[PDB]
């Protein structure tokens, strides 16, 4: 008994001194639009930090954190991965932004554009 | 040789089972729109968590964390206070969102409406 294990790479570069986020699938295709979850499963995000600003994941930020779609976020000790876990059958749509620390200053970094997850009914 | 110390309270209630953020000043008056930082100083945010979801600050998130407006962010060990510090003469405009943990689940909570800080030329 099992679900889907999806993978996205979180590519961050510095453009005019500010981070820019480009999301690619495992063979390098730019990700287009919503991620769909049809079953209990995981989405693994791998940080590829090209900024020199020592970026690390500290979590995934949600405006509707009790909406029941993603049920848990998991993070590797070194901040290089964060995973989203859907542990049940709750349908709907949710959005989120990545939250990262940096070693240049003490402000947290946020991805500007919300990622969308659609859990169909 | 000194600056200004501003105080806002972040009042979080649970509306329809998701958090809603109202900001109030020293006098308990609801405020909206931009904060001005017009010389090196501090903005202190107090948490008033009426959600029952054990919110605490873990930091402040910025899409453009290297723009020079806010130079540091401090946080109290109990997550009830965060402060934004301007330590230089950089004029410009920055935006941020509060980043909170909760005790219900492992998703981070974001305030949905970016607060603006304008530091005049
Ligand atoms: Ca779920
Ligand atoms: Ca500054
Ligand atoms: Na808990």
Q: Residue B76 belongs to a domain with what CATH number?
A: 2.60.40.420
Q: Which helix (H) or strand (E) holds A100?
A: strand A92-101
* DSSP letter (8 states) at residue A114: P
Using an 8 Å Cβ cutoff, are B61 and B115 in contact? no
Which of B65, B86, B88 is most worth mutating to test chain A (most A CB atoms within 10 A of its CB)? B65
- A79-102: burial string, b at 16+ Cβ within 10 Å, e else: bbebbbebeeeeeeebbbbbbbbb
Cβ atoms within 10 Å of A33's Cβ, excluding its own: 8
CB of B20 within 8 Å of a chain A CB? The answer is no
Using an 8 Å Cβ cutoff, are B11 and B51 in contact? no
CB of B12 within 8 Å of a chain A CB? The answer is no
Q: What tokens were used for A77?
A: 């000790």
DSSP letters for B33-62: SPEE--SSEEEEEEEEE-SSS--EEEEEEE
Q: What tokens were used for A16?
A: 């005019």
> Is B4 in a helix, a strand, or coil?
coil
> Is A87 in a helix, a strand, or coil?
coil
CB contacts, 8 Å: A98 with chain B: none
Q: Domain total for chain A?
A: 1
| Cα distance between residue B93 and residue B112, in whole Å | 18
Judged by CB atoms closer than 8 Å, whether chains meet at B104 and A64 is answered as: no
Classify burial at A12, counting beta carbons within 10 Å of its beta carbon; exposed 0-12, middle 13-18, buried 19 or more: buried
| Cα distance between residue B103 and residue B52, in whole Å | 9
Sheet strands side by side (includes A5-15) = A18-24, A5-15, A41-49, A81-86, A72-75
For this experimental structure, what is the resolution in angstroms?
A: 1.9
| Cα distance between residue A58 and residue A45, in whole Å | 12
Q: Which range of residues forms the domain containing residue A28?
A: 1-121
Ligand nearest to the CA of A93: 1
| Cα distance between residue B105 and residue B59, in whole Å | 18
Distance B69 CA to ligand 2 centre (A): 4
Using an 8 Å Cβ cutoff, are B41 and B7 in contact? no
Task: Find the residue in A nearest to B104 (Cα).
Answer: A66
Distance of CA A98 to the CA centre of its chain: 6
Instruction: Give first-to-last CA distance, chain A, whole Å.
Output: 20
Q: What tokens were used for A81?
A: 């991965």
Short-list A69, A6, A74, CA closest to A42:
A6
B107 vs A17, A53, A73: nearest CB: A73
Short-list B45, B48, B36, B39, CA closest to B12:
B48
Short-list B119, B96, B97, B121, CA closest to B110:
B97
Residues in chain B: 121
| Cα distance between residue B48 and residue B83, in whole Å | 15
| Cα distance between residue B20 and residue A25, in whole Å | 34
């Amino acid at each position: 008994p099992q679900g889907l294990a999806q993978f996205i790479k979180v590519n961050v570069t510095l453009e005019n001194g500010e981070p820019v986020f480009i999301y690619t699938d495992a063979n390098g295709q730019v990700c287009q639009g919503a991620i769909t979850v049809t079953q209990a499963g995981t989405i693994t995000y791998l940080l590829n930090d090209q900024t020199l600003k020592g970026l690390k994941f500290v979590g995934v930020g949600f405006v509707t954190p009790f909406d029941g779609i993603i049920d848990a976020v998991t993070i590797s000790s070194d901040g290089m991965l964060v995973q989203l876990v859907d542990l049940d059958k709750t349908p709907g749509t949710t959005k989120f932004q990545f939250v990262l620390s940096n070693t240049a200053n003490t402000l947290l970094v946020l991805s500007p554009d919300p990622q969308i997850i659609n859990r169909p009914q």
